[PDB]
């Protein structure tokens, strides 16, 4: 908003760090079945709702 | 007696249930008195109470209470029954002599609507279908 409180932007900082693809050294690991981050959020499609 | 807590006396149901104004609250007023004494002092244990006056609108009961953690109570094994944690809040469960007069229990032909334990323990046992294993 550019006028936001602290508990908003450390909530927003958390959502921004966990929007990242899988590192490519886990596809090589033993017995996983993950092949892409499926909790990825894009800022136009899906919004947090504050 | 109690008035039924409903807006403008409209109970919205069958005509037997229009009872806004003649309703009598099946637990006694002394039992109400002991209840909100052991609700204010939640650390104290309640023993029983007695009558010391009534006017026309107010009714005065002396409720006698017990500190369960005073060492004059936690010694003396004739009083150690109430420092045992099943006696916590005896009037919220209706276990004192004021409150148990409304449970309707007692031995006899006049009281066998509650013939196992309580009223709703009899009802569960008169209305369970006790289908056996070989039947």
């Amino acid at each position: 908003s550019s006028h936001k409180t602290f508990r908003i932007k450390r909530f927003l900082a958390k959502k921004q760090k966990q929007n990242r693809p899988i590192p490519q050294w886990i596809r090589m690991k033993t017995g996983n079945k993950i092949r892409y981050n499926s909790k990825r959020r894009h800022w136009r499609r899906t919004k947090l709702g504050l | 007696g109690r008035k039924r807590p409903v807006p403008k006396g409209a109970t919205y149901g069958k005509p037997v249930h229009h009872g806004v104004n003649q309703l009598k609250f099946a637990r006694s007023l002394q039992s109400v008195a002991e209840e909100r004494a052991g609700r204010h002092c939640g650390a104290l244990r309640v023993l029983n109470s007695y009558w010391v006056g009534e006017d026309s609108t107010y009714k005065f009961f002396e409720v006698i209470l017990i500190d369960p953690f005073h060492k004059a109570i936690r010694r003396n094994p004739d009083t150690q029954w109430i420092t045992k944690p099943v006696h916590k809040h005896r009037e919220m469960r209706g276990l004192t002599s004021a409150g148990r007069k409304s449970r309707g229990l007692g031995k006899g032909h006049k009281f066998h609507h509650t013939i196992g334990g309580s009223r709703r323990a009899a009802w569960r046992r008169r209305n369970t279908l006790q289908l056996h294993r070989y039947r």
Binding site: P21, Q24, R35, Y36, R40 | -
Partner: protein, 39 residues
């Protein structure tokens, strides 16, 4: 990445538009044109 628009991304999504197609169409009876048939 060198293999992230090729081996991360083609897994990443590629079926995410599949939100229901139709969610009912709650537009309340499209026969708004009063017809009423001879009464």
């Amino acid at each position: 990445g060198v293999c992230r628009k090729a081996a991360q991304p083609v897994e990443a999504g590629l079926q995410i538009p599949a939100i229901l197609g139709i969610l009912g169409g709650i537009l309340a009876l499209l026969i708004l044109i009063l017809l009423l048939l001879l009464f």
